[PDB]
Amino acid sequence: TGGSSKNLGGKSPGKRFGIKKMEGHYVHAGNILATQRHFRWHPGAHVGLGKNKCLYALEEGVVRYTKEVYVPNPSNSEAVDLVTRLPQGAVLYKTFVHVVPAKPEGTFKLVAML
Amino acid sequence: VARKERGWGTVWPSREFWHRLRVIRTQHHIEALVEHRNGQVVVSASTREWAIKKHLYSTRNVVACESVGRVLAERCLEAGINFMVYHPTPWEAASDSIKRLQHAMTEGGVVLREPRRIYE
Amino acid sequence: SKTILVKMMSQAGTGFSFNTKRSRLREKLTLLHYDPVVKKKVLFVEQK
RNA sequence: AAAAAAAAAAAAAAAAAAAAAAAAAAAAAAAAAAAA
RNA sequence: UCGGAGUACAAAAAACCCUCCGAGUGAUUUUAAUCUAGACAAACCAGUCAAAAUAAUCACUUAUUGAUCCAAAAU
RNA sequence: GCCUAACGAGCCUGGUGAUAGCUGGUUGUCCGAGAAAGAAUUUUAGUUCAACCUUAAAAAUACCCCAAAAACCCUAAAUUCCA
Ligand SMILES: [Mg+2]
Ligand SMILES: [Mg+2]
Ligand SMILES: [Mg+2]
Ligand SMILES: [Mg+2]
Ligand SMILES: [Mg+2]
Ligand SMILES: [Mg+2]
Ligand SMILES: [Mg+2]
Ligand SMILES: [Mg+2]
Ligand SMILES: [Mg+2]
DSSP states (O other): OOOOOOOOOOOOOOOOOEESSOTTOEEOTTOEEEEOSSOSEEEOBTEEEOTTSEEEEOSSEEEEEEEEEOOOOTTOHHHHHHHHHSOTTOOOEEEEEEEEEOSOSOOOOOOOOO | OOOOOOBOOSSSSOOOOSEEEEEEEOSSOEEEEEEETTSOEEEEEETTSHHHHHHSSOTTSHHHHHHHHHHHHHHHHHTTOOBOEEOOOTTGGGSHHHHHHHHHHHHHTOBOSOOOOTTO | OOEEEEEEEESSTTOEEEEEEESSOSSOOEEEEEETTTTEEEEEEEEO
């Protein structure tokens, strides 16, 4: 009996998208925080956005997650319109990641007393 | 040598700055603030202030924006902050009131476009 | 349609770029590129 | 015969294919309801 | 071989001669550089982000790709 | 077909302890600790990596783990992560 199943190429590995660090994790500058294919979490304070929508930590610190108000860039039109048609009482919210800096910025050392 | 917050960037405006010039145009009054990333309002010039209120006519005028501009310039120098960032909107940047706000600011001696960070 | 691999030549020195071009030839290839030796912005010309 | 412009000034309306987006402020603390 | 869904409902992973859609490139212009912290991913090989320091986009965008050796070429 | 009681290619001696990812065997006693299939592969009767594991060594935290936290329409048992 002809057993042809017409479907092809279901097979891909998973991309291991997801959250790499968790709230209250210590982080060094450069660590990737989470990696996603669509924006699930947006970059907050001290979190840089990679061209593939990676989130990495800019400072040395503690990673925090947050629900905050979303005010799209006036250059990006779709989001501008989505913001436009809302009923007059409602604001948009999203989830952000943050780094909270640990090390102080610097120190004043006494080099020489002349 | 301090920190800014390099970040956000799905949102607007860019929150990287020490001092952000903020200009709110109400249908009535022109208000200009200078803010710290902490949200604190450092130095402000508003029209509802009796000082600017009594000295001139028609609050919504381009003239009143020049005025609030150089009043905030004066007050800024007195506060010793010579550097702040301004992020107007694409449509806002073309209006006369704002061009004259920026000219009042420049003649005042106040430099926009904040100096870079050292070892960022 | 096809894709042609073309080798660009800089005005000065031995700097050589390699890039792809279109069969239909939408935009003929002439570039402003970076030369390492003089550390400059250059005019690169399409060659073989 | 029962309670005074559409906070102590501020924040819809009106004038450069049809829309949409660079004038104005209870009167002299002590004029809505419920009984031939 | 390569990628999107489901199966696999909320960190990752996850099978079939399972259920369904795709790719072995187009379209532009703005020619999208060097050098180095820290990372994801990962048997290995391949894959990925990227601060500081010097001086690419749209097409669901994600897939548009082949290791050594050996050949031709010029620098 | 037949070529000396086995001819799809004679018999013998060499090469020759041919070569078998395939069967079959592998010898005293007593104690410690102990494994279940992720990848590629003329690969799926096999190998070579990872993971688990055994024997030594050096160290510092390991499991368990309350809040808090992880998405957008609907979405159970539950996960991940931490004092
Ligand atoms: Mg799949
Ligand atoms: Mg798979
Ligand atoms: Mg070719
Ligand atoms: Mg840089
Ligand atoms: Mg015989
Ligand atoms: Mg043998
Ligand atoms: Mg092979
Ligand atoms: Mg075998
Ligand atoms: Mg723990």
